[model samples]
Target: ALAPLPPLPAQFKSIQHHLRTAQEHDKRDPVVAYYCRLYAMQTGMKIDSKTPECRKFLSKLMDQLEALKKQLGDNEAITQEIVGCAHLENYALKMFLYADNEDRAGRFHKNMIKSFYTASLLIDVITVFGELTDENVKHRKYARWKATYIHNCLKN
Candidate 1:
């Protein structure tokens, strides 16, 4: 016989809260990690690429990307957005790698050009809706809170 899965109690509003938290955390991890990598590269920091923090963040990002891919498997709109985001992230990583090596200046330039193209693709995916802004309306209230949290993070 197949093993039974765990069951939740009838009154579980916390489930929604937890799900939203997980989704947002997963989404933001890569954004912050990539930004940090870019900052370190631009400032010529000799950061260990295989640091624990980097590994944890990048691994989480890969998991989130895979989940997003599975979630939007056949949804063309969401799939395109996910693809664009992934491409941008990959380009960012390449740029970070080549920025440290003067011998690969030409390759770095080429990677930067590709990064620009990927960034444009990401922008296109994000701004596809003509005038209907706030595409994240489904999480509007949480998004507001997240904005405040991000601001606090930046401030501190």
Candidate 2:
């Protein structure tokens, strides 16, 4: 199963955090990988570090990122804000679709709960990129409600 990246340590603010993650997901989730790299490049450009290691790594990352962009095509959102928002939206929909599919098949397994909740969290994650549109809120609420209602029902 394709899962999202693990939570990062609180207060760990480093461009490599996303860059490393981008590499990890390079083969599995190219969309996630691309945005992570994009975020890294965008943040790295603003960092005050002028060390050779930093400069070299940032340039290498740019070249690699460009290749990824070409492979993924221009259909993707480019702006840092929209890129993140779009990526999260794609993941959220996938999780929600999986959860809904299993539910419709009469398989109310714990995975349904996990997927629904994960989808809900992904919707929240998109907020980091920008404000949520009304359509976003609709999906977020429905996913949350399904997960919560399912949990309550299974609590017995």
Candidate 3:
């Protein structure tokens, strides 16, 4: 059977603290693997196409998408696709183009372009990295990667 998820016996200091610690708190808390499972369920995909880590993370996403299908009841529409590189890049490019443009009429919020660009960029990273690794969140790697993407998006 699948193991239980997080929420250790002791009160967590903070959600961030909980997530970070709970990941490695296998002995005292247990459920590290299961926690990673749910983490993947609610998170993004990876970039590199092949590897155990990438494959496992990818399948976790697929399982959630499948779960979504089961929860919503099956239909052909509920399916997974390998969103290729160009598609996400196009999303970033298009969002970048209209980001500061006055022509975007329906966007009532100021951060719309940035929001969309961020989402597109994230998806692009998933497309590249395969799935969410613990390091992807706060590591310097992500910061530098994001900066590069921002530059690419704005590049003439």
Candidate 4:
């Protein structure tokens, strides 16, 4: 599911990182992939668009993102604050659900801890857009607690 990397100079290191991260998440977690792509676009645009190569890559990135947006049926505009929160929140919830199910099944795979930690991290990231609601705070605390507890159990 990884897409080919566009030709970019070392100056665009951050953007390149975001793109690779997006590609990594595309298959297993579309929501995070979407957010990562959107993030890359946002950071990429901050660079000097007068450069032909940068402009070209940005165009391609936007085009690819548009296709993904349509597939996800996400109507949110390129407002990273709003749309980023939406996607990350969705991803976090899914991670939490998967971890919860695994926990319920008494399966202690590393993924359970990973999911809990990722969900907790996502919930923290969501606050960058806006403050969390009561429900979100509750979930964040629970996820952090679960991740820590599971990790400590593994240590023992």
**Clashes found in each candidate (C-alpha, N, C closer than 3 A):** 0, 0, 11, 0
Top of the candidates by lDDT = 4
Name the candidate, 2 or 4, with the larger TM-score value. 4
Q: Model 1: per-residue lDDT, tens digit, 1-156?
A: 111212322332223232233233344544322322222232222233355554443344445445544644555434454554555445434533343242245332433433333332223223222222353232233323433444455457
Q: Write the per-residue lDDT of candidate 3 for residues 35-127, one digit (tens) a residue.
A: 333334333232342545545544644554344345434232222223333343344345444543422464434354344434333333343
Instruction: Give a tens-digit lDDT track for model 4, residues 31-72.
Output: 677667766776678775668888888888888888788777
Per-model TM-score versus the true fold: 0.25, 0.49, 0.28, 0.54
Tell me the alpha-carbon RMSD of every candidate. Answer: 19.0, 7.5, 13.4, 6.2
Best model per TM-score: 4
**Deviating ranges (above 4 Å) for candidate 4:** 1-77
User: In candidate 1, what residue range of length 10 has the lowest lDDT sum?
Assistant: 1-10
lDDT of 2 by residue, 30-143 (tens): 777776766666666667337566666567667777777777666555445566576768877988999989877878778898788767655654654767889779877887
Candidate 1's displacement at residue 46, Å, is 12
Model 4 gets an lDDT of 0.74
Model 2 TM-score on a 0 to 1 scale: 0.49
Could you tell me which 10 consecutive residues in candidate 3 have the lowest summed lDDT?
A: 9-18
Where in model 1 is the C-alpha error above 4 Å? 1-48, 81-156
User: Model 4 — which ten-residue stretch has the worst lDDT?
Assistant: 74-83
Question: Where's the lowest-lDDT run of ten residues in candidate 2?
Answer: 1-10
lDDT of all the models against the reference? 0.36, 0.68, 0.38, 0.74
* Cα lDDT, model 3, residue 42: 39
